[PDB]
């Protein structure tokens, strides 16, 4: 169990997502709602979905038939969330593959400035202090001008970018040919695929921390006295980082629920895995913010303006640290194979969870064998053709729209609040803890009980209405505001998951006969 789950949610959310979410929200002030959500919400909801999966004989959508069948569409919300997550997560792996393929030459493309994609506003990082501030480092400009080929907005997609579509097709062929057409990581989990990631993260940590000027980067990482907690993007960003890095409004953990024994002690395992994930995120944060401190000390700019305040921070600071590392070709090869390994394990787990939930939703409607093989290809083709809209020149804009709205926004707060509310105030903390006592052995303490009852609903509704009364718009890299139609598209992406629960509530109320109180009573009794 643990071996396929310690790679299942220790992935790109810790080495790529938490870095720029910490960077976008001021570094030190991001960790306060991070740890508040982690202790009051994240490990409670982690144990909550794991036990919801383990108690029910099935998992995913139909696990809400043995627990409050009225709210059966938390599984459907999880399906929508994991579909959009699969799309933009695999285009992160596309960028990692594109970085890996450009690393095989001896001189790295982001090491020096005299390249074809570099504007005349470019100098090397060791020359920026000498020349006296409207100038670009080679890592940021390589990223935005060769990897992204970043355009002037989401309304100008330009052209579908060549060779990123081929990298996305490569990672999708790897995913389609190693999920159900073959086998996942089975015998390679020992001594590789699970400790080579942590050895590489330790190498990046002991490189970034020994870089000059890393102390001010750690000071930016751990001092809350900037980006003050009166603006709600920090709270909702940290809450969605918790609920994203744990895959815990996703249905994946409920899918790797039912694949456990009934009387299996899965509390110490869940706390160990959650503390391992939080330690991985926090240690990778030390690494990447030490590198950003080095970058700001080298370039002479401030730490908050040295790189991309958006999803390029793991693709700017980590390649920069590779550049200031001995034999940078070798270490870039290992680092982007590492990003591919984390992302591929997490994507295998998410697509396996989505496919397991979709075949538990429709058993024998799609015949196993002949038509089970067709469905994986259909899902991979659909998510690839909706992943090619992040490949284009205006592809980071659509990707950041997905990353803030599709599977890591108010949808995650909505699903977490509704899971905790359903369990606590319909299923009952007493009755659910009786089930937990039957399975684990002990009733969970006042932490889990009062977290599902009060703390995680209060946190989720508080941050949800806090990001609405003091509304802030989605901005990319602190300079590009999004248009009204892009904000509407992102809110439609969020509402495609949040409105899975009231839609199934009105569907189950319309499809059942009787008065409304008797209807609700029948629909909330577990089966």
């Amino acid at each position, epitope marked *: 169990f643990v071996l396929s789950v310690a790679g299942g949610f220790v992935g790109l959310g810790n080495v790529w997502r938490f870095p720029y979410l910490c960077y976008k929200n001021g570094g030190g002030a991001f960790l306060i709602p991070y740890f508040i959500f982690l202790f009051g919400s994240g490990l409670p909801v982690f144990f909550l979905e794991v036990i919801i999966g383990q108690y029910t004989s099935e998992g995913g959508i139909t696990c809400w038939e043995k627990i409050c069948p009225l709210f059966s569409g938390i599984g459907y919300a999880s399906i929508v969330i994991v579909s959009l997550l699969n799309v933009y997560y695999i285009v992160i792996l596309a960028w990692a593959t594109y970085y890996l393929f450009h690393s095989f030459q001896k001189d790295l493309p982001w090491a020096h400035c005299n390249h074809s994609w570099n504007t005349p506003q470019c100098m090397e990082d060791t020359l920026r202090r000498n020349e006296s501030a409207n100038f670009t480092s080679p890592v940021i400009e390589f990223w935005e001008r060769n990897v992204l080929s970043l355009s002037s907005g989401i309304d100008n997609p330009g052209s579908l970018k060549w060779d990123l579509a081929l990298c996305l097709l490569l990672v999708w062929l790897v995913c389609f040919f190693c999920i159900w057409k073959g086998v996942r990581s089975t015998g390679k989990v020992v001594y590789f695929t699970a400790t080579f990631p942590f050895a590489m993260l330790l190498v990046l940590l002991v490189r970034g921390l020994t870089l000059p000027g890393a102390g001010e980067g750690i000071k930016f990482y751990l001092y809350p006295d900037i980006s003050r907690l009166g603006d709600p993007q920090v709270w909702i960003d940290a809450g969605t980082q918790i609920f994203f890095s744990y895959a815990i409004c996703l249905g994946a953990m409920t899918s790797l629920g039912s694949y456990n024994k009934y*009387k299996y*002690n899965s509390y110490r395992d869940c706390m160990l895995l959650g503390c391992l994930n939080s330690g991985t995120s926090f240690v990778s944060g030390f690494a990447i913010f030490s590198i950003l401190g080095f970058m700001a000390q080298e370039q002479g700019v401030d730490i908050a303006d040295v790189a991309e305040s958006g999803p390029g921070l793991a693709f700017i600071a980590y390649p920069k640290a590779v550049t200031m590392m001995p034999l940078p070709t070798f270490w870039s090869i290992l680092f982007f194979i590492m990003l591919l390994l984390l992302g591929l394990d997490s994507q295998f787990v998410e697509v396996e969870g989505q496919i397991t939930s979709l075949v538990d939703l429709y058993p024998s409607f799609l015949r196993k064998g002949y038509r089970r093989e067709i469905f994986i290809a259909i899902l991979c083709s659909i998510s690839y053709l909706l992943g090619l809209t992040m490949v284009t020149e205006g592809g980071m804009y659509v990707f950041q729209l997905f990353d803030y709205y599709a599977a890591s926004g108010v949808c995650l707060l909505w699903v977490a609040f509704f899971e905790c509310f359903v369990i606590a105030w319909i299923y009952g903390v*007493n*009755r659910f*803890s*009786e*089930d937990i*006592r*039957d399975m*684990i*052995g*002990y*009733r969970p303490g006042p932490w889990m009980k009062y977290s599902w009852a009060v703390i995680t609903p209060a946190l989720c509704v508080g941050c949800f209405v806090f990001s609405l009364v003091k509304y802030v718009p989605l901005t990319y890299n602190k300079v590009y505001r999004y248009p009204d139609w892009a904000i509407g598209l992102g809110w439609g992406l969020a509402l495609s998951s949040m409105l899975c629960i009231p839609l199934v509530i009105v569907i189950l109320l319309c499809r059942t006969e009787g008065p409304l109180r008797v209807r609700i009573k029948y629909l909330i009794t577990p089966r």
Partner: antibody
């Protein structure tokens, strides 16, 4: 103070019916999974039947599966154990035992109700 | 069921002498799910050692446990006069919960 008080002990005929009453106080009775553990007259201790915190998950021993009925009354905190078809090799000393955490076990026991079958 | 064969019941321990008893389970107990109980002379049993290593409330530190999986033991460092009792090991894992046999640790 946690103290489990049992009653209903006595002598019954073989195949008869008797109802025990483990009255409990000193803890939140609705949040602790009760059990009944009997002790044979040769002092070989034997678990009979447990019931979960809410009373939904009920287990019995293999010897007394089809004829013993454990029940609770969480309103006034009394544990019961219905017996029917009570055979000769069921005379014992029946303790009610509070075991909720499976890693802790029956950390609080009651007194004895000496049941004799003649 | 899980048949828990135990040490011979009647053993005579001199006061202040290090003695121990075993508990062999037929199946595999998870070693956080096996407990030891003490029943005095004619009184009710009480929990003594839980999860085969720990100690309950009021249990002296002279008592200790070891073993895992199949063979489980209770170890007494020095027997005092308040130890004339009968000890039952008890697995708690399988839903037919089974206590062990008696171990009437008596005196000389």
């Amino acid at each position: 103070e946690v103290q489990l008080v049992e009653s209903g002990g006595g002598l019954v005929k073989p195949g008869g019916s008797l109802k025990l009453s483990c009255a409990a106080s000193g803890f939140t009775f609705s949040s602790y999974a009760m059990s009944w553990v009997r002790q044979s007259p040769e002092k070989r201790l034997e678990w009979v039947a447990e019931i979960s915190s809410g009373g939904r998950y009920i287990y019995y021993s293999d010897t007394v599966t089809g004829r013993f009925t454990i029940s609770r009354d969480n309103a006034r905190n009394i544990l019961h154990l219905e017996m029917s078809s009570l055979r000769s090799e069921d005379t014992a000393m029946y303790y009610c035992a509070r075991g909720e955490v499976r890693q802790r076990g029956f950390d609080y026991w009651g007194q004895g109700t000496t049941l004799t079958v003649s | 069921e899980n048949v828990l064969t135990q040490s011979p019941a009647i053993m005579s321990t001199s006061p202040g002498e290090k003695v121990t008893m075993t508990c062999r389970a037929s199946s595999s107990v998870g070693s956080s799910y096996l407990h030891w109980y003490q029943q005095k002379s004619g009184a009710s049993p009480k929990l003594w050692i839980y999860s085969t290593s720990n100690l309950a409330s009021g249990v002296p530190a002279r008592f200790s446990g070891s073993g895992s999986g199949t063979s489980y033991s209770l170890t007494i460092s020095s027997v005092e006069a308040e130890d004339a009792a009968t000890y039952y090991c008890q697995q708690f894992s399988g839903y037919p919960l089974t206590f062990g046999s008696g171990t009437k640790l008596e005196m000389k």
